[PDB]
Amino acid sequence: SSVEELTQLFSQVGFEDKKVKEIVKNKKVSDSLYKLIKETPSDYQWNKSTRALVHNLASFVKGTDLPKSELIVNGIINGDLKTSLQVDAAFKYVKANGEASTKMGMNENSGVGIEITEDQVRNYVMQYIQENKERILTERYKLVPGIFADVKNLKELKWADPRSFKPIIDQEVLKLLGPKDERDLI
């Protein structure tokens, strides 16, 4: 309810004081955050990751009532939904399906259990390079920022960790282009 109660709960779950002050600036998001936090186990121990993810969720709900919202919360606190991206997907799914939403349906549509390995990223990158080989041979290293943009956008890599994308691309491009030479001067 009141700013004092909201303040108390948020700092108790471990939001830092400067963060709490910012959150309560937005009363709709604060209302959702409060209600979302209250539908988790009394003895659950928040951390930087889940606090942030539940705040994401609150920022999506933004004062409105979402049927089956607890499915998303349980997914966050149990480690099923690890990223803002998964939380946004789970939110969109639960919003689309309303009360017909189930854990498995949400999971299945929020990348839950999907782990793309460095080896799979590499396969997808290789395939892209094969498909665009002559455009890439012609443009050489100047095109690397473009390859990166296109690789991020590959739907097979939606749930992949995007920090792997750049090093794997640099390695694969080297195989085709050879090392940077006079052709690559800027």
**What domain range is 149 assigned to?**
115-186
Report how many domains make up the chain: 2
Residues 107 and 175 in one domain: no
Closest C-alpha to 11, from 21, 53, 98: 21
Of 98, 114, 130, the position where a domain reaches its end is 114
Residues 30 and 96 in one domain: yes
Contact at 8 Å (CB) between 147 and 174? no
Pure H helices in 62-164: 69-77, 84-97, 103-108, 118-131, 133-139, 144-152
Closest C-alpha to 68, from 29, 14, 107, 28: 107
Closest C-alpha to 49, from 80, 20, 91: 80
Closest C-alpha to 33, from 3, 52, 65, 55: 55
Distance, in Å, from the CA atom of 49 to the CA atom of 58, rounded to the nearest integer, reads 14
